[PDB]
RNA sequence: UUCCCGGGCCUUGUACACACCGCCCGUCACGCCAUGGGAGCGGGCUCUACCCGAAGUCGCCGGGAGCCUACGGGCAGGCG
C-alpha cells in the first residue's frame, strides 16, 4: 500500500493545469464565479499575492487589495472550479515567501519594496511572441 | 412763668407741600424680571507639530523595456 499515491489518485480528477504560474508579490486579477439569488456571474478581484501555501492539490493563495479605504484579503483554492481564469497584471520582486509586512505600510512604501521584476517580465514577453 | 397744654409775632433749619397723623432706611417672608460665580456638559472659529495624500504644473529618468521619427529627438511610462 502506498497511502500517499492513493490520495493523489483521488485528487487527480480535480487537478487543474490551465492557470498561470505566479509568485508572492505579483499583482494578479482573479475572475471568480459568484451566485446572487438564482443567478451566476463573474466578479474580478485584483490585488497583490501575499502568500501561497502548497499542499499539492490542496494549495491555496491569498490576495490583498485596498477597496474604498478598507483593506481586503481573499483566500482562493488554487484548483477551485469556481475560478474562471487568472490574469497576470504585474510581476513583483520580493525577498521572502510571506509578505504580511505590507499590511502596515502605506501605498508609497509598498511600491518601493515590491518593484517590478525585470527578468520574469522579459520571460513573459519572450513567451506569447510565438505567434 | 421752671414744667404740662394751646395760641400770637419775628427769626432759623428742612430731603415736608391735603404740609410731622409729613417723609423715610435696611434685613427678613412671598412673587416677577434680567444677571455674576459654579464640579462640569455641548458646540463654533483658530493656531502649532507630525502622518497619509488625488489632480496637475515643474524637475530627473525613459533602462534589463513599448510606440513614432524629421532620431545628439519625441510620446507613453517611472521617480521626486
Ligand atoms: Mg505548506
Ligand atoms: Mg513553496
Ligand atoms: Mg499543510
Ligand atoms: Mg492567508
Ligand atoms: Mg491560508
Ligand atoms: Mg508564500
Ligand atoms: Mg515558499
Ligand atoms: Mg517568508
Ligand atoms: Mg512579513
Ligand atoms: Mg400781636
Ligand atoms: Mg418757626
Ligand atoms: Mg422754605
Ligand atoms: Mg406720601
Ligand atoms: Mg417705612
Ligand atoms: Mg444691609
Ligand atoms: Mg410671607
Ligand atoms: Mg422671593
Ligand atoms: Mg452662568
Ligand atoms: Mg446661574
Ligand atoms: Mg507629499
Ligand atoms: Mg507629505
Curated annotation (Swiss-Prot):
Instruction: Kindly state which keywords UniProt assigns to this record, in alphabetical order.
Output: Ribonucleoprotein, Ribosomal protein, RNA-binding, rRNA-binding
Family annotation (InterPro entries): Ribosomal_bL19, Ribosomal_bL19_CS, Ribosomal_bL19_sf, Translation_prot_SH3-like_sf
Give a GO biological-process term.
Answer: translation
Pfam families, alphabetized:
Ribosomal_L19
Where does the source fall among the domains of life? Bacteria
GO MF, one example: structural constituent of ribosome
Query: NCBIfam families attached here?
Result: rplS_bact (TIGR01024)
Q: How does it assemble?
A: Part of the 50S risobomal subunit. Contacts protein L14. Forms a bridge to the 30S subunit in the 70S ribosome, contacting the 16S rRNA.
The job of this chain, per UniProt, is described as:
Contacts the 16S rRNA of the 30S subunit (part of bridge B6), connecting the 2 subunits.
Stated name of the protein: Large ribosomal subunit protein bL19
Q: Which gene underlies this protein? A: rplS
